[PDB]
PDB file of C-alpha atoms and ligand atoms in Angstrom:
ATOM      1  CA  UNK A 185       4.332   6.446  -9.055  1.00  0.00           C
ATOM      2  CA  UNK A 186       5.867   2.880  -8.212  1.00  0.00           C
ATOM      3  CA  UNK A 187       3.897  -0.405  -7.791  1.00  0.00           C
ATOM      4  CA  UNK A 188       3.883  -4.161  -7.743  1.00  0.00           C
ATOM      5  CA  UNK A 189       4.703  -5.720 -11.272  1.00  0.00           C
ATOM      6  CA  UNK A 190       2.080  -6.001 -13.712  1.00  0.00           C
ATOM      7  CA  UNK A 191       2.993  -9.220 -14.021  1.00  0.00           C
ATOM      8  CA  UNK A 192       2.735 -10.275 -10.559  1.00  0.00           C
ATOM      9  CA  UNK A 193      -0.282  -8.947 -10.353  1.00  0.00           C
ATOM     10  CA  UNK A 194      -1.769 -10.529 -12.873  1.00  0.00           C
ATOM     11  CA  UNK A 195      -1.015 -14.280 -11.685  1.00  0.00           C
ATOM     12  CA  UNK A 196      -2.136 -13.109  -7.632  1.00  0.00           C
ATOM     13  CA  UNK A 197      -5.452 -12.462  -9.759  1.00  0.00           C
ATOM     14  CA  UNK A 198      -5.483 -16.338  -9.946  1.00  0.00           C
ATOM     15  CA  UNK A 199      -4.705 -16.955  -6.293  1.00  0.00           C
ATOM     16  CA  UNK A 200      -7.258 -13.857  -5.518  1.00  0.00           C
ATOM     17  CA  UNK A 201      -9.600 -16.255  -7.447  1.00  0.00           C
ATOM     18  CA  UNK A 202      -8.694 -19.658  -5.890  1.00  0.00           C
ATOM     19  CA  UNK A 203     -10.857 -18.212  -2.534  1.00  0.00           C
ATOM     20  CA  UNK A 204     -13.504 -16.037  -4.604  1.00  0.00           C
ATOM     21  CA  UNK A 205     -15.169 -18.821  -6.102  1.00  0.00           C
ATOM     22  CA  UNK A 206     -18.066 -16.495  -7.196  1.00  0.00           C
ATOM     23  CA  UNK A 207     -15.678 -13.570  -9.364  1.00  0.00           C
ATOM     24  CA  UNK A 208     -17.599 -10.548  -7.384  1.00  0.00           C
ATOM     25  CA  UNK A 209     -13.536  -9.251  -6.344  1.00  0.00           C
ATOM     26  CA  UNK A 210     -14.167  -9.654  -2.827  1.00  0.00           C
ATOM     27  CA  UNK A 211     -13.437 -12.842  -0.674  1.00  0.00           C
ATOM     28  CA  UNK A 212     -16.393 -13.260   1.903  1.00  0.00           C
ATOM     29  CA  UNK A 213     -15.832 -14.591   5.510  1.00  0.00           C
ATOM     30  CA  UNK A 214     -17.112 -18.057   4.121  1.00  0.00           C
ATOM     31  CA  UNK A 215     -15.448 -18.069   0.680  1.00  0.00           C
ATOM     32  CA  UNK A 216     -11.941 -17.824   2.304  1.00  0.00           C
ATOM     33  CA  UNK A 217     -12.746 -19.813   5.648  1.00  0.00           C
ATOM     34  CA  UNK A 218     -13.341 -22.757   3.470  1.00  0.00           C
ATOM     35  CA  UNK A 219      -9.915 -22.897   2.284  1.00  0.00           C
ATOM     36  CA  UNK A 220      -9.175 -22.192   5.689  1.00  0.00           C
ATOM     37  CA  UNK A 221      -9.027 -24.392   9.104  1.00  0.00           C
ATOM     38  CA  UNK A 222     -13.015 -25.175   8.275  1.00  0.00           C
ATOM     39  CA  UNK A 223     -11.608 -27.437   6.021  1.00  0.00           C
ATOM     40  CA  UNK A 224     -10.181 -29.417   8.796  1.00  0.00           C
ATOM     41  CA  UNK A 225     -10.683 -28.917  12.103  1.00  0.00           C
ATOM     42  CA  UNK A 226     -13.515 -27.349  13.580  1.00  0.00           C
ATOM     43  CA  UNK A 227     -12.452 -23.414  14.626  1.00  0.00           C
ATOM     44  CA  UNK A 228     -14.429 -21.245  16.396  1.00  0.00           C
ATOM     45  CA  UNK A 229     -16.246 -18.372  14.545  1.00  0.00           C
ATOM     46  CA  UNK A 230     -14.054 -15.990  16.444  1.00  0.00           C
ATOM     47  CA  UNK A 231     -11.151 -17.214  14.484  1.00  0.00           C
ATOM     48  CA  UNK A 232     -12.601 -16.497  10.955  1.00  0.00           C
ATOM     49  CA  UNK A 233     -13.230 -12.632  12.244  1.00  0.00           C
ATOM     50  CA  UNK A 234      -9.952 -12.254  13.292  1.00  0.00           C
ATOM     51  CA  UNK A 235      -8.435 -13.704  10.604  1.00  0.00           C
ATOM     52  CA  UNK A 236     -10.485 -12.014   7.731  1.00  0.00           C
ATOM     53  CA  UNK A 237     -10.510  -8.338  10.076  1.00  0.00           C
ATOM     54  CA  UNK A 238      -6.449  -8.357  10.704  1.00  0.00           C
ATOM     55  CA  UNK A 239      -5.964  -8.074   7.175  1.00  0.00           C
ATOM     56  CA  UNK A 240     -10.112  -6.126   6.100  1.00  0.00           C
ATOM     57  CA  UNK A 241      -8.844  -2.735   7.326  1.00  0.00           C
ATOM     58  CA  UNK A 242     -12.162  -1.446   6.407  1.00  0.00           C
ATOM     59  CA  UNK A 243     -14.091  -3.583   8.300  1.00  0.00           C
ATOM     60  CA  UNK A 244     -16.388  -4.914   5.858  1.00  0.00           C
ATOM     61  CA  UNK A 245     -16.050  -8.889   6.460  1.00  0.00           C
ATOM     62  CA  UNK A 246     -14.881  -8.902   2.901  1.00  0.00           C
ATOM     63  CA  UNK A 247     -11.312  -9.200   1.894  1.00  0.00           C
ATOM     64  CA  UNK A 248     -10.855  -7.001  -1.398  1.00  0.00           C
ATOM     65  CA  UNK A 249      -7.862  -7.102  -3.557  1.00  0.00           C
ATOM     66  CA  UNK A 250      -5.912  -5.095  -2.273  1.00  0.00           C
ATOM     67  CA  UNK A 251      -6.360  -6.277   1.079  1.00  0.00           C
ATOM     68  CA  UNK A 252      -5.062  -9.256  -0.178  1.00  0.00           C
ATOM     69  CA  UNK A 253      -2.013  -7.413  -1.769  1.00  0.00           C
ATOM     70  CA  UNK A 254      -1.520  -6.384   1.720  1.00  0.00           C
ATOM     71  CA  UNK A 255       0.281  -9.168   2.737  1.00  0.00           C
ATOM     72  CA  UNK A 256       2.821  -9.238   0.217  1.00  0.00           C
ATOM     73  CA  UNK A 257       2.924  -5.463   1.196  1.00  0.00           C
ATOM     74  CA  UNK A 258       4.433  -6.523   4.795  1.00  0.00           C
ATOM     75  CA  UNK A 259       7.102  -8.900   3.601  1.00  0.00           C
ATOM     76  CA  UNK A 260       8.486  -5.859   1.167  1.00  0.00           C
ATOM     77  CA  UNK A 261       7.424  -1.910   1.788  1.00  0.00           C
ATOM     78  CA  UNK A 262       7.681  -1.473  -1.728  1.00  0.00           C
ATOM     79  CA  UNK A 263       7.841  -5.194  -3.050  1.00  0.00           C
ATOM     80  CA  UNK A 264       9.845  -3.648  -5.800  1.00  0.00           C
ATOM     81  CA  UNK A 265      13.343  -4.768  -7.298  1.00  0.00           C
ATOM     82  CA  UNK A 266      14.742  -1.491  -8.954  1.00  0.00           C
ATOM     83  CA  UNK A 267      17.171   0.299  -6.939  1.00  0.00           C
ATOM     84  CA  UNK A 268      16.934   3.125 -10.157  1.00  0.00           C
ATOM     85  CA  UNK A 269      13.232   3.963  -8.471  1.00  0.00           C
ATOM     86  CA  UNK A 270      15.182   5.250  -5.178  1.00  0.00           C
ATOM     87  CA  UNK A 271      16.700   7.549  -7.386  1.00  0.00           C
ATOM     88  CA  UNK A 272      13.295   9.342  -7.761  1.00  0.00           C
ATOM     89  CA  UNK A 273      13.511  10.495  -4.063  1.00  0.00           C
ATOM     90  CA  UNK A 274      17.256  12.311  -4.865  1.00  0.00           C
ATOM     91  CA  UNK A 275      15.731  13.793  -7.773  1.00  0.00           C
ATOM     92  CA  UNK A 276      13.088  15.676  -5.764  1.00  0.00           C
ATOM     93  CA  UNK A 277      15.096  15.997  -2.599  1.00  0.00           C
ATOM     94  CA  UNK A 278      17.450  19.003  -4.228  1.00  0.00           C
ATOM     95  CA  UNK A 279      18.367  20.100  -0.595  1.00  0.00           C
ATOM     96  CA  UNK A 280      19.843  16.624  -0.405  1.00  0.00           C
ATOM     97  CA  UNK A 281      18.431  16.780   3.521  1.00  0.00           C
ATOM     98  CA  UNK A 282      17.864  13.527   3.179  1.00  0.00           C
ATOM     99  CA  UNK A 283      13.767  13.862   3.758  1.00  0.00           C
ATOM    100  CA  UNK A 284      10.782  15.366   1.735  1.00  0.00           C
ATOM    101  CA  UNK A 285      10.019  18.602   3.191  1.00  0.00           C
ATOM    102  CA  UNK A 286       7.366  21.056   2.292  1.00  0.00           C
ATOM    103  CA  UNK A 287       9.812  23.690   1.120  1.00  0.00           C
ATOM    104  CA  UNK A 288      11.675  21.331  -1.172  1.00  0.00           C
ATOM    105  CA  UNK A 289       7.938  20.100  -2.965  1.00  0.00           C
ATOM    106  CA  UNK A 290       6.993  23.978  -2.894  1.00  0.00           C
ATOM    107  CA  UNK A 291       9.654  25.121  -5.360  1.00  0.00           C
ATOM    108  CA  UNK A 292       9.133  22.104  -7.651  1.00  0.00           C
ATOM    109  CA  UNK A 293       5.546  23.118  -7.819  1.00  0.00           C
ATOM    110  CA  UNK A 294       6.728  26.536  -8.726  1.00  0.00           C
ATOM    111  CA  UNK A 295       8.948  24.937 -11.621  1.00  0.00           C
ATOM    112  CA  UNK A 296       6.063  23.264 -12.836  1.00  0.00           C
ATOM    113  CA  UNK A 297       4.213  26.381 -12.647  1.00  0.00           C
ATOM    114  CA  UNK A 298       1.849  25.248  -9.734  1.00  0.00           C
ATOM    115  CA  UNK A 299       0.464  27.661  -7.175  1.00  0.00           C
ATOM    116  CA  UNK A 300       0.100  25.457  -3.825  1.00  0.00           C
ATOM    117  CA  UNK A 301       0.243  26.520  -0.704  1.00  0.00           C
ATOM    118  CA  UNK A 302       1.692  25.095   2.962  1.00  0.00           C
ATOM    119  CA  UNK A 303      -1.646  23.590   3.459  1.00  0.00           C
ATOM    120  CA  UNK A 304      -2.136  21.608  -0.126  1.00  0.00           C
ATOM    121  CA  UNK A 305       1.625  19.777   0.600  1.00  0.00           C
ATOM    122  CA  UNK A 306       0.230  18.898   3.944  1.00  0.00           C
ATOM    123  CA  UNK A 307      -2.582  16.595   2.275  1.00  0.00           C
ATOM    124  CA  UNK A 308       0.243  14.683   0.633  1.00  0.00           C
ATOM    125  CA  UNK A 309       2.620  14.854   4.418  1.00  0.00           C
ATOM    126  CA  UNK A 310      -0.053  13.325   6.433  1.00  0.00           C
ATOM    127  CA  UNK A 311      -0.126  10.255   3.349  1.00  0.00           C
ATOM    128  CA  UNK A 312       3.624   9.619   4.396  1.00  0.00           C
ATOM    129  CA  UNK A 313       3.565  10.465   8.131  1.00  0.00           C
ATOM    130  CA  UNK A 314       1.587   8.376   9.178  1.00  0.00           C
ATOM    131  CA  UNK A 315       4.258   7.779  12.128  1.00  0.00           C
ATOM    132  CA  UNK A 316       4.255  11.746  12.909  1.00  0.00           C
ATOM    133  CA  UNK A 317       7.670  11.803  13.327  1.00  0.00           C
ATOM    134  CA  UNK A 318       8.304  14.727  11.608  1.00  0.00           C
ATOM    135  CA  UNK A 319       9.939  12.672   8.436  1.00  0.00           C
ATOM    136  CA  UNK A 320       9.187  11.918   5.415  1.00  0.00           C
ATOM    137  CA  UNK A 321      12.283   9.064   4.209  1.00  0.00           C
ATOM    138  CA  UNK A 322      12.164   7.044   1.179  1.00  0.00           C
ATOM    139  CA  UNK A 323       9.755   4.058   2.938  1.00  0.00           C
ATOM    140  CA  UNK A 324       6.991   6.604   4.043  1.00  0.00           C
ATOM    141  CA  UNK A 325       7.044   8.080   0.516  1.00  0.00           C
ATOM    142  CA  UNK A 326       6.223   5.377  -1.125  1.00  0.00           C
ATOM    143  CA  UNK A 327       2.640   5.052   0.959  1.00  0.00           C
ATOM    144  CA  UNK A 328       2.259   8.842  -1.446  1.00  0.00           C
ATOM    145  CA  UNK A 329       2.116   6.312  -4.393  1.00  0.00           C
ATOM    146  CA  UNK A 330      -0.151   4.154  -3.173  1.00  0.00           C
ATOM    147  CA  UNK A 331      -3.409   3.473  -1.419  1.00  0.00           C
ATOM    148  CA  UNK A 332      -3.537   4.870   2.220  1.00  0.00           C
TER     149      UNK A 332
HETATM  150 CA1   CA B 145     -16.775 -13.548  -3.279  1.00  0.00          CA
HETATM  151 CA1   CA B 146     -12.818  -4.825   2.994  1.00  0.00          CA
HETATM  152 CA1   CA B 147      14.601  17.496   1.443  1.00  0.00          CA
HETATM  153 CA1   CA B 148       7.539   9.432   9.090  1.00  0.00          CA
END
């Protein structure tokens, strides 16, 4: 279960607050175009929506927290400094196959005393596969640990 520092966090609640001027926790098209190129020049609406939607996966016109997390989230996959966290993946990987693979999770589950079947691993798989190409390496596990 890995994640951006608390600490980090914390302080991008200040910049997440610099565009949300009202403190609802979601940046509108207008509360964040202001601090945009409206400021200056005059762009086109078009511009806000594609600026706000590249980043509002969901589609709402509203730019939530972690949607503004997501662009530290493409400078770093994991925008983590401890190399002991990729340990974590060795630790689970027993085969040492260098992938996750449903077998290897089974028997785990079976130390732990868990009963899950083929099907249950898949809902975690798809989480990390997003690629589907048939691996599951230490970058796609990480999107296990967090949102989807
Ligand atoms: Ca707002
Ligand atoms: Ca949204
Ligand atoms: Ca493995
Ligand atoms: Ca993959």
């Amino acid at each position: 279960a890995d994640q951006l520092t608390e600490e980090q966090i914390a302080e991008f609640k200040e910049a997440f607050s610099l565009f949300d001027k009202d403190g609802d926790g979601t940046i509108t098209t207008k509360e964040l175009g202001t601090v945009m190129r409206s400021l200056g020049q005059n762009p086109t609406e078009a511009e806000l929506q594609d600026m706000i939607n590249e980043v509002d996966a969901d589609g709402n016109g509203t730019i939530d927290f972690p949607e503004f997390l997501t662009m530290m989230a493409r400078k770093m996959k994991d925008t983590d400094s401890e190399e002991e966290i990729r340990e974590a993946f060795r630790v689970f990987d027993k085969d040492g196959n260098g992938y996750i693979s449903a077998a290897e999770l089974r028997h785990v589950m079976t130390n732990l005393g868990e009963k899950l079947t083929d099907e249950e691993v898949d809902e975690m798989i798809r989480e990390a596969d997003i690629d589907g190409d048939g691996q599951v390496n230490y970058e796609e596990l990480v999107q296990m640990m967090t949102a989807k």
